[PDB]
Design an enzyme around this catalytic site. Structure first.
Site, PDB file in Angstrom:
ATOM      1  N   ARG A   1       1.128  -1.342  -0.273  1.00 61.65           N
ATOM      2  CA  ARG A   1      -0.112   0.371  -0.061  1.00 61.65           C
ATOM      3  C   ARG A   1       0.788   1.220  -0.261  1.00 61.65           C
ATOM      4  O   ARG A   1       0.724   2.488  -0.855  1.00 61.65           O
ATOM      5  CB  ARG A   1      -0.996  -0.010   1.066  1.00 61.65           C
ATOM      6  CG  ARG A   1      -1.738   1.010   1.598  1.00 61.65           C
ATOM      7  CD  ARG A   1      -2.870   0.941   2.251  1.00 61.65           C
ATOM      8  NE  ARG A   1      -3.919   2.215   2.739  1.00 61.65           N
ATOM      9  CZ  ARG A   1      -4.338   2.081   3.164  1.00 61.65           C
ATOM     10  NH1 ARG A   1      -5.607   0.933   2.994  1.00 61.65           N
ATOM     11  NH2 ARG A   1      -5.802   3.204   3.146  1.00 61.65           N
TER      12      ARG A   1
ATOM     13  N   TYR B   1      -2.933 -12.026   2.096  1.00 63.31           N
ATOM     14  CA  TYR B   1      -1.487 -11.784   0.624  1.00 63.31           C
ATOM     15  C   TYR B   1      -0.501 -11.432   0.713  1.00 63.31           C
ATOM     16  O   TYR B   1      -0.183 -10.868   1.669  1.00 63.31           O
ATOM     17  CB  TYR B   1      -3.159 -11.240  -0.197  1.00 63.31           C
ATOM     18  CG  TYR B   1      -2.886  -9.856   0.352  1.00 63.31           C
ATOM     19  CD1 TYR B   1      -2.579  -9.017   0.079  1.00 63.31           C
ATOM     20  CD2 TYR B   1      -4.662  -9.579   1.144  1.00 63.31           C
ATOM     21  CE1 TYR B   1      -2.753  -7.634   0.799  1.00 63.31           C
ATOM     22  CE2 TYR B   1      -4.453  -8.050   1.568  1.00 63.31           C
ATOM     23  CZ  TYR B   1      -4.261  -7.785   1.209  1.00 63.31           C
ATOM     24  OH  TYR B   1      -3.958  -6.117   1.869  1.00 63.31           O
TER      25      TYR B   1
ATOM     26  N   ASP C   1     -13.232   8.180   2.947  1.00 59.33           N
ATOM     27  CA  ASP C   1     -14.154   8.278   3.734  1.00 59.33           C
ATOM     28  C   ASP C   1     -14.606   8.802   5.016  1.00 59.33           C
ATOM     29  O   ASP C   1     -15.801   9.212   5.479  1.00 59.33           O
ATOM     30  CB  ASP C   1     -13.026   7.340   4.903  1.00 59.33           C
ATOM     31  CG  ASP C   1     -12.421   5.640   4.419  1.00 59.33           C
ATOM     32  OD1 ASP C   1     -13.549   5.898   3.637  1.00 59.33           O
ATOM     33  OD2 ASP C   1     -11.717   5.003   5.215  1.00 59.33           O
TER      34      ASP C   1
HETATM   35  C1  LIG Z   1      -8.491  -2.852   8.454  1.00 59.30           C
HETATM   36  C2  LIG Z   1      -8.472  -2.845   6.446  1.00 59.30           C
HETATM   37  C3  LIG Z   1      -8.053  -2.961   5.565  1.00 59.30           C
HETATM   38  C4  LIG Z   1      -8.410  -2.228   4.351  1.00 59.30           C
HETATM   39  N1  LIG Z   1      -8.536  -3.031   3.574  1.00 59.30           N
HETATM   40  C5  LIG Z   1      -8.418  -1.927   2.296  1.00 59.30           C
HETATM   41  C6  LIG Z   1      -7.972  -2.691   0.832  1.00 59.30           C
HETATM   42  O1  LIG Z   1      -7.529  -4.256   0.526  1.00 59.30           O
HETATM   43  N2  LIG Z   1      -9.127  -1.996  -0.624  1.00 59.30           N
HETATM   44  C7  LIG Z   1      -9.437  -1.546  -0.046  1.00 59.30           C
HETATM   45  O2  LIG Z   1      -9.737  -0.957  -1.234  1.00 59.30           O
HETATM   46  N3  LIG Z   1     -10.083  -0.605   0.876  1.00 59.30           N
HETATM   47  C8  LIG Z   1      -9.567  -0.768   2.074  1.00 59.30           C
HETATM   48  N4  LIG Z   1     -10.107  -0.787   2.742  1.00 59.30           N
HETATM   49  C9  LIG Z   1     -10.002   1.096   3.512  1.00 59.30           C
HETATM   50  C10 LIG Z   1      -9.521   1.778   3.308  1.00 59.30           C
HETATM   51  O3  LIG Z   1      -9.131   1.962   4.065  1.00 59.30           O
HETATM   52  C11 LIG Z   1      -9.993   3.419   3.372  1.00 59.30           C
HETATM   53  O4  LIG Z   1     -11.102   3.140   2.904  1.00 59.30           O
HETATM   54  C12 LIG Z   1      -9.484   4.607   2.437  1.00 59.30           C
HETATM   55  O5  LIG Z   1      -8.163   4.680   3.060  1.00 59.30           O
HETATM   56  C13 LIG Z   1     -10.368   5.910   2.595  1.00 59.30           C
HETATM   57  O6  LIG Z   1      -9.165   6.683   1.886  1.00 59.30           O
HETATM   58  P1  LIG Z   1      -9.387   8.076   2.310  1.00 59.30           P
HETATM   59  O7  LIG Z   1      -8.347   9.101   1.262  1.00 59.30           O
HETATM   60  O8  LIG Z   1     -10.720   8.402   1.960  1.00 59.30           O
HETATM   61  O9  LIG Z   1      -8.799   8.382   3.512  1.00 59.30           O
HETATM   62  P2  LIG Z   1      -7.566   7.977   4.136  1.00 59.30           P
HETATM   63  O10 LIG Z   1      -6.693   7.197   3.372  1.00 59.30           O
HETATM   64  O11 LIG Z   1      -7.701   8.514   5.850  1.00 59.30           O
HETATM   65  O12 LIG Z   1      -7.137   9.310   3.961  1.00 59.30           O
HETATM   66  C14 LIG Z   1      -7.097  11.034   4.626  1.00 59.30           C
HETATM   67  C15 LIG Z   1      -5.897  12.004   4.486  1.00 59.30           C
HETATM   68  O13 LIG Z   1      -6.401  13.356   5.009  1.00 59.30           O
HETATM   69  C16 LIG Z   1      -5.454  13.903   5.905  1.00 59.30           C
HETATM   70  N5  LIG Z   1      -6.105  14.746   6.405  1.00 59.30           N
HETATM   71  C17 LIG Z   1      -7.512  14.039   7.703  1.00 59.30           C
HETATM   72  N6  LIG Z   1      -7.275  15.915   8.409  1.00 59.30           N
HETATM   73  C18 LIG Z   1      -7.092  16.178   7.547  1.00 59.30           C
HETATM   74  C19 LIG Z   1      -7.145  17.653   7.851  1.00 59.30           C
HETATM   75  N7  LIG Z   1      -7.237  18.562   8.877  1.00 59.30           N
HETATM   76  N8  LIG Z   1      -5.910  18.136   6.966  1.00 59.30           N
HETATM   77  C20 LIG Z   1      -4.969  17.979   5.881  1.00 59.30           C
HETATM   78  N9  LIG Z   1      -5.421  16.609   6.117  1.00 59.30           N
HETATM   79  C21 LIG Z   1      -6.106  15.936   6.826  1.00 59.30           C
HETATM   80  C22 LIG Z   1      -4.988  12.024   6.040  1.00 59.30           C
HETATM   81  O14 LIG Z   1      -3.772  12.857   7.146  1.00 59.30           O
HETATM   82  C23 LIG Z   1      -4.690  11.176   5.295  1.00 59.30           C
HETATM   83  O15 LIG Z   1      -3.986  11.287   4.819  1.00 59.30           O
HETATM   84  C24 LIG Z   1      -9.489  -1.483   4.451  1.00 59.30           C
HETATM   85  C25 LIG Z   1      -9.945  -0.598   5.924  1.00 59.30           C
HETATM   86  C26 LIG Z   1      -9.367  -1.167   7.385  1.00 59.30           C
HETATM   87  C27 LIG Z   1      -9.593  -0.443   8.453  1.00 59.30           C
END
Ligand SMILES: Cc1cc2nc3c(=O)[nH]c(=O)nc-3n(C[C@H](O)[C@H](O)[C@H](O)COP(=O)(O)OP(=O)(O)OC[C@H]3O[C@@H](n4cnc5c(N)ncnc54)[C@H](O)[C@@H]3O)c2cc1C
Length: 375
Positions: free
Chosen positions: A106, A213, A292
């Protein structure tokens, strides 16, 4: 003149959106709270439906070279090792769904994704603290006392989204009664047991599981992530160290292959998983959300990053249709084109039996995002 997009968060969803939007010709900057970029020492699973989006970005071929291409997903009973499902992936997936299913490191995927963003447009050490949609533009205030202005803002800032908080106020407290243990395995420890270590397998029991995996096509690094009942999380870190003794007690009774994996670890970390999640919030005024921040879900189907990347791709298509000057039409079209699929993912996650039996996963992996008529 010339309209500006600010993206809050350089996670997989924010970085995908930045890449797709800049490649579409938009003016985009990204603001990430972390002071430095960290390659997460974890794996991730990417289905064909999202490899088609990496294709638009120019990254699909590279990811195929980096990742492992399992021929099957196996669901196995934790205690007996019985095969509960044998879901065909590999060449079947390439032909049937139109792209590969891969499992990959990742942190390296994340670095590749940020490197596709225009240099000079990603800013670390920028933690959003306040945001005000003034009506004709949005001002963003960061914890370091700097600020920036944009025509629209994308909340790609995860489950703790500050965009979501600025719109809805403080979220009610959500507790954690379960954890994910994570470990990367290498070494003679891996080599010793390579014959029994399948490329993509979920081991299930009544109230917990272990997913396993490889992270690379060399199959020299093997990853697990669990879901396990746990006391409420009250640690300050996003994670803490775990231990083999902890894991062996949690997986008492599991098949010798799982015991071998626990014995083969050097370092395990534990991560809190939330008990509950709020309903989706797609947009409001000049603010739009993805991933998310938008539709937080329990990780039962492990499609959360894939859904964030689909959000980014569909949001880009909608802004390409309307232009930034008509953001309200774009944000409405984005929600209209994402909410039913997000709801199907939610309903299947609620059932928590994804690939537990021999079901047909085409509705997920065969989905054609770029083919959908926006209407
Ligand atoms: C155990 C587990 C296993 C998973 N396995 C998978 C998988 O195999 N495949 C898959 O597709 N998904 C998987 N997921 C889901 C996936 O990890 C999340 O859904 C994904 O990370 C969401 O991405 P995002 O960009 O929405 O948020 P995030 O990855 O949470 O990124 C948000 C970013 O915003 C930043 N941020 C937060 N607040 C602020 C702020 N105030 N100012 C500036 N920056 C800020 C954070 O630092 C971060 O870098 C899994 C989740 C879990 C819990």
């Amino acid at each position: 003149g010339r309209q500006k997009i600010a993206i809050v968060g350089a996670g997989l969803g924010g970085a995908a959106a930045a890449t797709l939007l800049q490649q579409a010709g938009f003016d985009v900057e990204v603001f990430e709270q972390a002071p430095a970029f960290t390659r997460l020492g974890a794996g991730i699973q990417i289905g064909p439906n999202v490899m088609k989006i990496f294709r638009r970005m120019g990254l699909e071929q590279k990811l195929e070279l980096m990742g492992s291409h399992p021929d099957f997903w196996f669901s196995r009973d934790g205690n007996t090792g019985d095969y509960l499902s044998r879901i065909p992936l590999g060449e079947f997936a390439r032909r049937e769904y139109g792209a590969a299913y891969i499992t990959i490191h990742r942190g390296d995927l994340h670095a590749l994704q940020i490197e596709a963003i225009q240099p000079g447009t990603v800013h670390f050490g920028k933690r959003l603290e306040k945001i005000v949609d003034e009506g004709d533009q949005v001002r963003l205030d960061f914890a370091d006392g700097t600020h920036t202005v944009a025509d629209i803002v994308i909340g790609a800032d995860g489950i703790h989204s500050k965009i979501r908080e600025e719109l809805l106020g403080a979220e009610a407290p959500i507790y954690s009664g379960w954890v994910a243990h994570r470990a990367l395995i290498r070494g003679v420890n891996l080599a010793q047991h390579a014959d029994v270590f399948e490329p993509c397998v979920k081991w299930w029991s009544e109230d917990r599981h272990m997913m396993v995996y490889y992270t690379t096509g060399k199959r020299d690094e093997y990853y697990f992530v669990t879901g396990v009942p746990h006391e409420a999380w009250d640690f300050q870190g996003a994670f803490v160290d775990s231990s083999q003794e902890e894991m062996r007690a949690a997986f008492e009774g599991y098949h010798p292959t799982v015991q071998k994996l626990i014995d083969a670890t050097e370092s395990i970390t534990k991560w809190p998983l939330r008990n509950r999640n709020p309903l989706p919030l797609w947009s409001r005024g000049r603010l739009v959300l993805l991933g998310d921040a938008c539709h937080p879900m329990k990780p039962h189907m492990a499609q959360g990053a894939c859904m964030a990347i689909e959000d980014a791709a569909m949001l880009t298509r909608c802004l390409q249709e309307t232009g930034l000057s008509d953001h309200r039409t774009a944000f409405a079209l984005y929600e209209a084109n994402r909410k039913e699929r997000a709801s199907q993912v939610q309903s299947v996650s609620n059932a928590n039996t994804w690939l537990y039996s021999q079901e047909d996963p085409a509705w997920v992996y065969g989905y054609d995002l770029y083919g959908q008529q926006l209407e």
